Each structure stands twice: as structure tokens, then as C-alpha cells.
Design a protein around this ligand. Structure first.
Ligand SMILES: Nc1ncnc2c1ncn2[C@H]1C[C@H](O)[C@@H](COP(=O)(O)OP(=O)(O)OP(=O)(O)O)O1
Ligand SMILES: Nc1ncnc2c1ncn2[C@H]1C[C@H](O)[C@@H](COP(=O)(O)OP(=O)(O)OP(=O)(O)O)O1
Ligand SMILES: [Ca+2]
Ligand SMILES: [Ca+2]
Ligand SMILES: [Ca+2]
Ligand SMILES: [Ca+2]
Ligand SMILES: [Ca+2]
Length: 341
DNA sequence: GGGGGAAGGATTC
DNA sequence: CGGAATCCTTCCCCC
């Protein structure tokens, strides 16, 4: 089996450049402003010029202006990045049939019935890696290996504007030389946990006992790391369909007043329904982020689809159920819809 | 014991 | 310090 992985480079910031070439060369920073005050939000993306000075996704806009006060701060425009993304996907879908769109900027192509030999694949990369830019002017990275995971790991290493292959021999070298923190699916919390057990390489997962491991990262996660280490990881490429659509907003003031919240919650719902498009959800969750950034949320599932009217109706019950089962003040409130018909 | 889910909390990105 | 979506873990009804 041969998996080819494409990943659009510094995507949001890269699109704002295609749309405004002048920016190419200068530090660009796409961010999300909440509203509580001027320049209050987080950074979503930054091109490499901005990154090499310490600006990366996740940090406070304030903390970034204090580093590159003279950088171009642009507001995020997801609807645009989504359309540009959709065109390229369709552009990718002309190489394989077996295709898995992971996110707005990633995709896995099972280029197996279209190719052989790694060399034959690599070439296919430089190809894809070139039609995209010809037609859309976007630069991407390609990674290719035996399974989904190593193909990604490859692309991570080989970025930016790269292409790279990890044959079966190189995989073996990695299963024992690569930091676990760098395995897809593993994050800060689970990462800073495997240490507490004495694991830093995929290979370690074989030493530790299954029950010990199973109890810090989880049974699913555990089985996942073991499989990669035994080199038994092999998941078919496929589809993936949004199983949930929702929206959350930050209120100008943290509050516990049902009347104050209601308007923000209703804005979330109306926005949510628009995105639902022609999909009927049978479940709904009200979601709230406390001021210490916790997330609490109550939902209800229905034996049939939900109408905006029922949605407006039920959400208020859920918003209360919450306000009761807890004590903290609310900062952000929103809704999520799932179990589509 | 465990299927089959709904409901609640935690993570990754 | 923002926001979207998924991912895991527990509780329940019952054969
Ligand atoms: N806290 C966050 N809030 C909003 N969006 C975020 C946040 N953290 C990360 N992201 C988004 C922005 C990007 O779409 C994406 C980052 O993807 P990434 O695949 O790691 O590639 P890269 O190193 O080439 O640059 P880029 O990340 O921007 O695409 O996730
Ligand atoms: N909750 C989740 N747990 C694990 N993987 C997820 C989750 N949600 C989404 N993904 C997957 C599918 C996404 O397309 C993919 C990655 O999104 P993304 O912004 O690219 O990069 P990344 O997670 O790959 O880390 P990096 O910052 O190095 O690029 O992760
Ligand atoms: Ca990317
Ligand atoms: Ca990506
Ligand atoms: Ca990254
Ligand atoms: Ca990592
Ligand atoms: Ca990232």
C-alpha cells in the first residue's frame, strides 16, 4: 500500500498573500479577535517570516504585537480559505479515487492503483506539487509512505515547499529514533505523560506493560502507539464526514445571568443553522467556556430531526441545566449540532 | 458480561 | 490569551 499526503503550507496566511501579492516577503499574521477589547484574540497562522521571530498559532495577539508591532495583522476569513481549499481538493481528486480529506488543509491520497515503486510515486508528487501551484499559486508539501501516519510524519519533516519519502527501511529506523511527541495524534498532555512512564520512542511502547500504558493515555491511544511500534498500523484511506457543526462566541463580559446570555446563544444558533445547510441534526449541545477556560456542556438527542424552532426552544433548557450543575461564571457560549439524518 | 447508546469530560489542532 | 471539531470515559436499560 502506498499513501501520498499533501499539506498546504502556512495556509491561511498563504491565501491572504495570493489575494494580495504585495504581502509576499513581509511578515503576515492571520488572527481571530474576540471583541472584549481592541486587539484581543489569538493568532491563527503566521507565514515563515513571522514564525522565525517567535510568532506562531496559539499565542495572544498582544504578545505578538510586542514582537513584530510592524507586521501585517489580518482578520481571519475562513469562508475564503475554505473555497480555495475546496478547489485544490477537486484538483487532487484527479490523481486517485481513494482519497481522504482530513481538514481544510490536508488530504491523503491512496495512490496505489495509479502507481507502483516509490520513485514512480515521488514523481507523482512533484507533479501534484506543481499543478496546484500552476493553477492556484499555492505551495504545499508532500509526504509518502506505507501508511497514513508515516506519510504525515514525512511531510512534517520535509516542510516547507518539500516532498519526501519514507520507505520501509527508514520506518524501522524511526520506530526507534523519532521522538514520540512528534507522532500524529499525540499532544502536550499525553506527551508530558509518556515520560512519567519512561517512553520517548515508539519502540518503548513494547517494553512497558499494556495495562500500565493503557492507564495514562487511554486504551485506544495505547493500542495505537503499540501498532505503530510493531509496524502493524494500517488504516484504509477514506471519506470522513463532518459529524458535527457548531459555533461559540465570547461575551463582552463573563456572566451567569440567563437573560444576558440568551442573545449570544441565539446568535450562535442562527449562525449554526446557516452552516448546517441541507443537513438535519438529531442532537444538540449547548457549550460554555468558564472564565478559567474550562468547557462544560449539556446536550439532548431527539428521536427525529431538529428544527431551528425546536433548537431555539431546547437550547434554553440546556443552558439552564448547565447554570445549575455548576457554579463558575461564563465567558463564551455556543451550540453544536450532531447525529445528522 | 456486554451490546448499544446517550450523556459528560478531556484533547488535539 | 480564539475557536472548531473530535476524541475518550462513564452511566444506564436490559437480554
Ligand atoms: N489555536 C488555534 N486557533 C485557531 N486555528 C488554529 C489554532 N491552532 C492551530 N490552528 C489552525 C491554523 C491552521 O489552519 C492550522 C495549522 O496547520 P499546519 O498543518 O501545522 O502547517 P504549517 O507549518 O505549514 O503552517 P499552517 O499550520 O498554518 O498550515 O491549524
Ligand atoms: N481531535 C483530534 N484528534 C486527533 N486528530 C485530529 C483531531 N481533530 C482533527 N484531527 C486531525 C485531522 C486534521 O485534518 C489533522 C490535522 O490538522 P492540522 O491543523 O493540520 O495539523 P496537525 O494536527 O496535523 O499538527 P501540526 O501543527 O504539526 O501541523 O488532524
Ligand atoms: Ca499545513
Ligand atoms: Ca495540516
Ligand atoms: Ca506545525
Ligand atoms: Ca507533536
Ligand atoms: Ca499548526
Amino acid at each position: 500500500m502506498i499513501v501520498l499526503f499533501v499539506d498546504f503550507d502556512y495556509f491561511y496566511a498563504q491565501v491572504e498573500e495570493v489575494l494580495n501579492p504585495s504581502l509576499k516577503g513581509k511578515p503576515v499574521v492571520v488572527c481571530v479577535f474576540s471583541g472584549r477589547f481592541e486587539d484581543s484574540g489569538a493568532v491563527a497562522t503566521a507565514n515563515y517570516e513571522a514564525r522565525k521571530f517567535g510568532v506562531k498559532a496559539g499565542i495572544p495577539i498582544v504578545e505578538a504585537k510586542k514582537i513584530l508591532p510592524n507586521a501585517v495583522y489580518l482578520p481571519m476569513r475562513k469562508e475564503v480559505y475554505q473555497q480555495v481549499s475546496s478547489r485544490i481538493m477537486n484538483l487532487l481528486r484527479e490523481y486517485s479515487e481513494k482519497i481522504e480529506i482530513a481538514s481544510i488543509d490536508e488530504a491523503y491520497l491512496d495512490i496505489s492503483d495509479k502507481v507502483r515503486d516509490y520513485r514512480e510515486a515521488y514523481n507523482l508528487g512533484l507533479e501534484i506539487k506543481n499543478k496546484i501551484l500552476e493553477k492556484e499559486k499555492i505551495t504545499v508539501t508532500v509526504g509518502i509512505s506505507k501508511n497514513k501516519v508515516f506519510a504525515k510524519i514525512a511531510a512534517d519533516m520535509a516542510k516547507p515547499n518539500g516532498i519526501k519519502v519514507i520507505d520501509d527501511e527508514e520506518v524501522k529506523r524511526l520506530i526507534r529514533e523519532l521522538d514520540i511527541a512528534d507522532v500524529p495524534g499525540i499532544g502536550n498532555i499525553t506527551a508530558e505523560k509518556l515520560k512519567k512512564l519512561g517512553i520517548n520512542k515508539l519502540v518503548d511502547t513494547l517494553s512497558i506493560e499494556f495495562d500500565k500504558l493503557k492507564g495514562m493515555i487511554g486504551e485506544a491511544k495505547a493500542k495505537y502507539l503499540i501498532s505503530l511500534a510493531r509496524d502493524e498500523y494500517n488504516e484504509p484511506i477514506r471519506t470522513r464526514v463532518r459529524k458535527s457543526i457548531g459555533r461559540i462566541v465570547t461575551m463582552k463580559r463573563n456572566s451567569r445571568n440567563l437573560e444576558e446570555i440568551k442573545p449570544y446563544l441565539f446568535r450562535a444558533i442562527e449562525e449554526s443553522y446557516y452552516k448546517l445547510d441541507k443537513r438535519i441534526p438529531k442532537a444538540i449541545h449547548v457549550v460554555a467556556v468558564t472564565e478559567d477556560l474550562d468547557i462544560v456542556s449539556r446536550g439532548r438527542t431527539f428521536p427525529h430531526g431538529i428544527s431551528k424552532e425546536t433548537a431555539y426552544s431546547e437550547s434554553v433548557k440546556l443552558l439552564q441545566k448547565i447554570l445549575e450543575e455548576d457554579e463558575r461564571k461564563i465567558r463564551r457560549i455556543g451550540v453544536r449540532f450532531s447525529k445528522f439524518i
